[PDB]
Design an enzyme around this catalytic site. Sequence first.
Site, PDB file in Angstrom:
ATOM      1  N   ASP A   6       0.297  -7.390   2.002  1.00 29.24           N
ATOM      2  CA  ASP A   6       0.625  -6.067   1.758  1.00 29.24           C
ATOM      3  C   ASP A   6       2.272  -6.119   1.893  1.00 29.24           C
ATOM      4  O   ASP A   6       2.706  -5.704   2.926  1.00 29.24           O
ATOM      5  CB  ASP A   6       0.090  -5.382   2.903  1.00 29.24           C
ATOM      6  CG  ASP A   6       0.273  -3.784   2.763  1.00 29.24           C
ATOM      7  OD1 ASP A   6       0.782  -3.423   1.617  1.00 29.24           O
ATOM      8  OD2 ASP A   6      -0.016  -3.063   3.831  1.00 29.24           O
TER       9      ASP A   6
ATOM     10  N   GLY B 251       2.380   6.926   8.269  1.00 31.19           N
ATOM     11  CA  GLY B 251       3.846   7.085   7.837  1.00 31.19           C
ATOM     12  C   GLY B 251       4.664   6.197   8.195  1.00 31.19           C
ATOM     13  O   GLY B 251       6.081   6.338   7.951  1.00 31.19           O
TER      14      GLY B 251
ATOM     15  N   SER C  40       4.025   3.046   7.893  1.00 35.13           N
ATOM     16  CA  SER C  40       3.720   1.815   6.868  1.00 35.13           C
ATOM     17  C   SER C  40       4.884   1.596   6.137  1.00 35.13           C
ATOM     18  O   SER C  40       5.596   2.416   5.749  1.00 35.13           O
ATOM     19  CB  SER C  40       2.463   2.399   5.953  1.00 35.13           C
ATOM     20  OG  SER C  40       1.322   2.377   6.646  1.00 35.13           O
ATOM     21  N   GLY C  41       5.051   0.298   6.018  1.00 32.38           N
ATOM     22  CA  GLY C  41       6.309  -0.342   5.049  1.00 32.38           C
ATOM     23  C   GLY C  41       7.300  -0.624   5.849  1.00 32.38           C
ATOM     24  O   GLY C  41       8.290  -1.253   5.471  1.00 32.38           O
TER      25      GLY C  41
ATOM     26  N   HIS D  62       0.885  -1.194   0.097  1.00 33.84           N
ATOM     27  CA  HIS D  62       0.134  -0.030   0.243  1.00 33.84           C
ATOM     28  C   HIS D  62       0.989   1.325   0.056  1.00 33.84           C
ATOM     29  O   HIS D  62       0.512   2.304  -0.119  1.00 33.84           O
ATOM     30  CB  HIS D  62      -1.115   0.100   1.080  1.00 33.84           C
ATOM     31  CG  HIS D  62      -0.438   0.593   2.526  1.00 33.84           C
ATOM     32  ND1 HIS D  62       0.001  -0.469   3.468  1.00 33.84           N
ATOM     33  CD2 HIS D  62      -0.714   1.678   3.092  1.00 33.84           C
ATOM     34  CE1 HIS D  62       0.109   0.347   4.604  1.00 33.84           C
ATOM     35  NE2 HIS D  62      -0.210   1.540   4.244  1.00 33.84           N
TER      36      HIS D  62
END
Length: 223
Positions: free
Chosen positions: A84, A175, A177-178, A40
């Site tokens: 994801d 922020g 994320s990942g 995402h």
Amino acid sequence: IVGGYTCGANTVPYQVSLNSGYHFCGGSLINSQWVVSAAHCYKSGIQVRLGEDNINVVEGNEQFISASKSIVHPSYNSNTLNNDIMLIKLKSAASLNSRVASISLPTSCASAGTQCLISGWGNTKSSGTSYPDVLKCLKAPILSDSSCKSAYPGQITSNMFCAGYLEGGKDSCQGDSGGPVVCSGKLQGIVSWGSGCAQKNKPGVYTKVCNYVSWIKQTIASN
Ligand SMILES: [Ca+2]
């Protein structure tokens, strides 16, 4: 990261910032040429920033390397966030050193109750907004499957796990994320989603990286 701490410059040397004119997501360096992040987090036009502490000051240990390729998982479902995970190839290999270093992929999946290190430049507020400039860190334990499914009924797949604190107060957030969830020295999770940040009974949900090692390895053997 809400309820975390300032990591300390370059103490999380596999943490990357993904930049498209601004920081928008974390990632983890898994070898000199490849970053793992969340699907995402996909954007066209990604620059990978390694060796960062303050993402708004060039402090002298950074490497800024454009992505040449991004590869979202073939089964990523952006509605449920199942699968994801994404790979990002760097245009040129990073120079690995004490500040810029890879993290190992797991052999085995992590265990419920294990305390993991989650890090990022995401929001530090559960209610409202404040984004830090320096990297923040959080230690959070993996929750049982049954507890994760209770928190998010009909939403948790076998490619996700929860981690955090059901009382609220400590979590990853927008922020982050990942970015990495590191448990026993291996990349076990990717910051994926949650209902708000740090809310009671709504822990963070993380992509279960151990389910993806064969895809990762075959994809990097091929690109
Ligand atoms: Ca910097």
